[PDB]
Amino acid sequence: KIHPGVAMTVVRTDEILSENILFSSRASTSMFIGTPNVSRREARVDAVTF
């Protein structure tokens, strides 16, 4: 338990799960949302997947 001739500083990262809060003003962005489409992918005899 002899204190050495050098002094050690110990550095460690830390991970902290935050719970964040978002703000945005009125008309912060503007969405040009278009009409969605349909493409029949699976034309199965069992059940059709669009």
Add this chain to the structure above:
Amino acid sequence: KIHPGVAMTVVRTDEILSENILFSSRASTSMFIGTPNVSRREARVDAVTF
């Protein structure tokens, strides 16, 4: 052509093609006939595999 100490029980199987007669009574089974449905499998550029 001298007898050994042991004997054998030679076993083979014999196939036979038999014309058979099947009988079943009336109303033996109930059947739900689904509508036939088409599906492409391999869309070949020459000749599509239906």
